[PDB]
Coordinates of all heavy atoms in Angstrom, one line a residue:
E1 N 38.4 225.0 150.5 CA 39.1 224.0 151.2 C 40.2 223.4 150.4 O 40.2 223.5 149.2 CB 38.2 222.9 151.7 CG 37.8 221.9 150.6 CD 36.7 221.0 151.1 OE1 36.3 221.1 152.2 OE2 36.3 220.1 150.3
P2 N 41.2 222.8 151.1 CA 42.4 222.2 150.3 C 42.0 221.2 149.3 O 41.0 220.5 149.4 CB 43.2 221.6 151.4 CG 42.9 222.4 152.6 CD 41.4 222.7 152.5
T3 N 42.8 221.2 148.2 CA 42.6 220.3 147.0 C 43.6 219.1 147.1 O 43.6 218.3 146.2 CB 42.8 221.1 145.8 OG1 44.1 221.7 145.8 CG2 41.8 222.2 145.6
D4 N 44.4 219.0 148.2 CA 45.4 217.9 148.3 C 44.7 216.6 148.1 O 43.6 216.3 148.6 CB 46.1 218.0 149.6 CG 46.7 219.4 149.8 OD1 46.0 220.4 149.9 OD2 48.0 219.5 149.8
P5 N 45.5 215.6 147.5 CA 44.8 214.3 147.1 C 44.4 213.5 148.3 O 43.4 212.7 148.1 CB 46.0 213.6 146.3 CG 47.2 214.3 146.8 CD 46.9 215.7 147.0
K6 N 45.0 213.6 149.5 CA 44.5 212.8 150.6 C 43.7 213.7 151.6 O 43.4 213.2 152.7 CB 45.7 212.2 151.3 CG 46.6 211.3 150.5 CD 45.8 210.0 150.0 CE 46.7 209.2 149.1 NZ 45.9 208.2 148.3
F7 N 43.4 215.0 151.3 CA 42.7 215.7 152.2 C 41.3 215.1 152.5 O 40.8 215.1 153.6 CB 42.5 217.2 151.7 CG 41.5 218.0 152.6 CD1 41.9 218.3 153.9 CD2 40.3 218.4 152.2 CE1 41.0 219.0 154.7 CE2 39.4 219.1 153.0 CZ 39.8 219.4 154.2
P8 N 40.6 214.5 151.5 CA 39.3 213.9 151.8 C 39.4 212.7 152.7 O 38.4 212.3 153.3 CB 38.8 213.4 150.4 CG 39.5 214.3 149.4 CD 40.9 214.6 150.0
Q9 N 40.6 212.1 153.0 CA 40.8 211.1 153.9 C 41.1 211.7 155.3 O 41.2 210.9 156.3 CB 42.0 210.2 153.5 CG 41.7 209.2 152.4 CD 41.3 209.9 151.1 OE1 42.1 210.5 150.4 NE2 39.9 209.8 150.8
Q10 N 41.2 213.0 155.5 CA 41.5 213.6 156.8 C 40.2 213.9 157.5 O 39.8 215.0 157.7 CB 42.4 214.8 156.6 CG 43.7 214.5 156.0 CD 44.7 215.6 155.9 OE1 44.7 216.4 155.0 NE2 45.6 215.6 156.9
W11 N 39.6 212.8 157.9 CA 38.2 212.8 158.5 C 38.2 213.6 159.7 O 37.1 214.1 160.0 CB 37.8 211.3 158.8 CG 38.8 210.6 159.6 CD1 40.0 209.9 159.2 CD2 38.8 210.5 161.1 NE1 40.6 209.4 160.3 CE2 39.9 209.7 161.5 CE3 37.9 211.0 162.0 CZ2 40.2 209.4 162.8 CZ3 38.2 210.6 163.4 CH2 39.3 209.9 163.7
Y12 N 39.3 213.7 160.4 CA 39.3 214.4 161.8 C 39.4 215.9 161.6 O 39.2 216.6 162.6 CB 40.5 213.9 162.6 CG 41.8 213.7 161.7 CD1 42.7 214.7 161.6 CD2 41.9 212.6 160.9 CE1 43.8 214.6 160.8 CE2 43.0 212.5 160.1 CZ 43.9 213.5 160.1 OH 45.0 213.3 159.2
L13 N 39.7 216.4 160.4 CA 39.8 217.9 160.2 C 38.5 218.5 159.9 O 38.1 219.5 160.5 CB 40.8 218.2 159.1 CG 42.3 217.8 159.4 CD1 43.2 218.2 158.2 CD2 42.8 218.4 160.7
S14 N 37.7 217.8 159.1 CA 36.3 218.3 158.8 C 35.5 217.2 158.3 O 36.0 216.2 157.8 CB 36.4 219.5 157.7 OG 36.9 219.0 156.5
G15 N 34.2 217.4 158.4 CA 33.2 216.4 157.9 C 31.8 216.9 158.2 O 31.6 217.7 159.0
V16 N 30.9 216.3 157.4 CA 29.5 216.5 157.6 C 29.1 215.9 159.0 O 28.1 216.3 159.6 CB 28.6 215.9 156.5 CG1 28.8 216.8 155.2 CG2 29.0 214.5 156.2
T17 N 29.8 214.8 159.4 CA 29.3 213.9 160.4 C 29.4 214.6 161.8 O 28.7 214.1 162.7 CB 30.1 212.6 160.4 OG1 31.4 212.8 161.0 CG2 30.3 212.1 159.0
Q18 N 30.2 215.6 162.0 CA 30.4 216.3 163.3 C 31.4 215.6 164.2 O 31.7 216.1 165.3 CB 29.1 216.5 164.1 CG 29.3 217.2 165.5 CD 28.1 217.9 166.0 OE1 27.2 218.3 165.2 NE2 27.9 217.9 167.3
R19 N 32.0 214.4 163.8 CA 33.1 213.8 164.5 C 34.4 214.3 163.9 O 35.1 213.6 163.3 CB 33.0 212.3 164.4 CG 31.6 211.7 164.3 CD 31.5 210.2 164.5 NE 31.9 209.4 163.2 CZ 31.7 208.1 163.0 NH1 31.1 207.4 163.9 NH2 32.1 207.6 161.9
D20 N 34.7 215.6 164.2 CA 35.9 216.2 163.8 C 36.3 217.3 164.7 O 35.6 217.7 165.7 CB 35.8 216.7 162.3 CG 34.8 217.8 162.1 OD1 34.9 218.8 162.9 OD2 33.9 217.6 161.3
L21 N 37.5 217.9 164.5 CA 38.1 218.9 165.3 C 37.7 220.3 164.9 O 38.3 221.3 165.5 CB 39.7 218.7 165.3 CG 40.2 217.4 165.8 CD1 41.7 217.2 165.4 CD2 40.0 217.3 167.3
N22 N 36.8 220.4 164.0 CA 36.2 221.7 163.6 C 37.3 222.7 163.1 O 37.4 223.9 163.5 CB 35.4 222.4 164.7 CG 34.4 223.4 164.3 OD1 34.0 223.4 163.1 ND2 34.1 224.4 165.1
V23 N 38.3 222.2 162.3 CA 39.4 223.0 161.8 C 39.0 223.8 160.6 O 39.4 225.0 160.5 CB 40.6 222.0 161.5 CG1 41.7 222.8 160.8 CG2 41.1 221.4 162.9
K24 N 38.2 223.3 159.7 CA 37.8 224.1 158.6 C 37.1 225.4 159.0 O 37.3 226.5 158.4 CB 36.9 223.3 157.7 CG 36.6 223.9 156.3 CD 36.0 222.9 155.3 CE 34.6 222.5 155.6 NZ 34.0 221.8 154.5
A25 N 36.4 225.4 160.1 CA 35.7 226.6 160.6 C 36.8 227.7 161.0 O 36.6 228.9 160.7 CB 34.9 226.3 161.8
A26 N 38.0 227.3 161.5 CA 39.0 228.2 161.8 C 39.7 228.7 160.5 O 39.9 229.9 160.4 CB 40.1 227.6 162.8
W27 N 40.0 227.8 159.6 CA 40.5 228.2 158.3 C 39.6 229.3 157.6 O 40.1 230.2 157.0 CB 40.6 227.0 157.4 CG 41.6 226.0 157.8 CD1 42.6 226.1 158.7 CD2 41.7 224.6 157.3 NE1 43.3 224.9 158.9 CE2 42.8 224.0 158.0 CE3 40.9 223.9 156.4 CZ2 43.1 222.6 157.8 CZ3 41.3 222.5 156.2 CH2 42.3 221.9 156.9
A28 N 38.3 229.1 157.7 CA 37.4 230.0 157.0 C 37.3 231.3 157.7 O 37.0 232.3 157.1 CB 36.0 229.3 156.9
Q29 N 37.6 231.4 159.0 CA 37.7 232.6 159.7 C 39.1 233.3 159.4 O 39.3 234.4 159.9 CB 37.7 232.4 161.3 CG 36.3 231.9 161.9 CD 36.3 231.8 163.4 OE1 36.2 230.6 163.9 NE2 36.5 232.8 164.1
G30 N 39.9 232.7 158.6 CA 41.2 233.3 158.1 C 42.4 232.8 158.8 O 43.5 233.4 158.6
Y31 N 42.4 231.8 159.7 CA 43.5 231.4 160.5 C 44.0 230.0 160.0 O 43.3 229.0 160.1 CB 43.1 231.3 162.0 CG 42.6 232.6 162.4 CD1 41.2 232.8 162.7 CD2 43.4 233.7 162.6 CE1 40.7 234.0 163.2 CE2 42.9 234.9 163.0 CZ 41.6 235.1 163.3 OH 41.1 236.3 163.7
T32 N 45.2 230.0 159.4 CA 45.9 228.9 158.9 C 47.3 228.7 159.5 O 48.0 227.7 159.1 CB 45.9 228.9 157.4 OG1 46.6 230.1 157.0 CG2 44.5 228.9 156.7
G33 N 47.7 229.5 160.4 CA 49.0 229.4 161.0 C 50.0 230.4 160.6 O 51.2 230.3 161.2
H34 N 49.7 231.3 159.7 CA 50.7 232.3 159.3 C 51.4 233.0 160.5 O 50.7 233.4 161.4 CB 50.0 233.4 158.4 CG 49.8 233.0 157.0 ND1 48.6 232.9 156.4 CD2 50.7 232.8 156.0 CE1 48.7 232.6 155.1 NE2 50.0 232.5 154.8
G35 N 52.7 232.9 160.5 CA 53.5 233.7 161.5 C 53.8 232.9 162.7 O 54.6 233.4 163.6
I36 N 53.3 231.7 162.9 CA 53.5 230.9 164.1 C 54.5 229.8 163.8 O 54.6 229.3 162.7 CB 52.1 230.2 164.5 CG1 51.1 231.3 164.6 CG2 52.3 229.5 165.8 CD1 51.3 232.4 165.6
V37 N 55.3 229.5 164.8 CA 56.5 228.6 164.7 C 56.3 227.5 165.7 O 56.2 227.7 166.9 CB 57.8 229.4 165.0 CG1 58.9 228.4 164.9 CG2 58.0 230.5 164.0
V38 N 56.3 226.3 165.1 CA 56.1 225.0 166.0 C 57.3 224.2 165.8 O 57.8 224.0 164.6 CB 54.8 224.3 165.5 CG1 54.6 223.0 166.4 CG2 53.6 225.2 165.6
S39 N 57.8 223.6 166.8 CA 58.9 222.6 166.7 C 58.5 221.3 167.3 O 57.9 221.2 168.4 CB 60.2 223.1 167.5 OG 61.2 222.3 167.3
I40 N 58.9 220.2 166.6 CA 58.7 218.8 167.0 C 59.9 218.3 167.6 O 61.0 218.1 167.0 CB 58.3 217.9 165.7 CG1 57.2 218.5 164.9 CG2 58.1 216.5 166.2 CD1 55.9 218.7 165.7
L41 N 59.8 217.9 168.9 CA 60.9 217.4 169.6 C 60.9 215.9 169.5 O 60.0 215.2 170.2 CB 60.9 217.8 171.1 CG 61.5 219.2 171.5 CD1 61.0 220.2 170.5 CD2 61.1 219.5 172.9
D42 N 61.7 215.3 168.7 CA 61.6 213.9 168.3 C 62.9 213.3 167.8 O 64.0 213.6 168.2 CB 60.4 213.7 167.4 CG 59.7 212.4 167.5 OD1 60.3 211.3 167.2 OD2 58.5 212.3 168.0
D43 N 62.7 212.4 166.8 CA 63.9 211.7 166.2 C 64.4 212.4 164.9 O 65.2 211.8 164.2 CB 63.5 210.2 165.9 CG 62.4 210.1 164.9 OD1 61.9 211.1 164.3 OD2 61.8 209.0 164.9
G44 N 64.0 213.6 164.6 CA 64.4 214.4 163.5 C 63.2 214.8 162.6 O 62.1 214.4 162.8
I45 N 63.5 215.5 161.5 CA 62.5 215.9 160.6 C 63.1 216.0 159.2 O 64.2 216.5 159.0 CB 61.9 217.3 161.0 CG1 60.8 217.8 160.0 CG2 63.0 218.4 161.0 CD1 60.2 219.1 160.3

């Protein structure tokens, strides 16, 4: 799992508690978004 300094604060991505979006399970299946393109329609980036 990621080592980023605030990743432990991303409670909604994974947790023991089961109150999360079950994203680590997808990452472990090998899916992290490679090749996919997303655009944010907003005030800039």
Side-chain angles (χ1 to χ4, degrees):
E1 77 187 1
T3 57
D4 304 63
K6 303 295 177 195
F7 174 69
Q9 284 62 71
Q10 299 187 276
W11 56 273
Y12 43 94
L13 294 183
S14 59
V16 290
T17 76
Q18 177 159 331
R19 325 190 284 195
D20 62 54
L21 298 168
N22 200 28
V23 169
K24 191 165 68 167
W27 295 342
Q29 295 180 243
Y31 303 109
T32 56
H34 277 118
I36 309 298
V37 179
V38 182
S39 185
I40 306 302
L41 278 47
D42 210 290
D43 59 12
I45 182 179

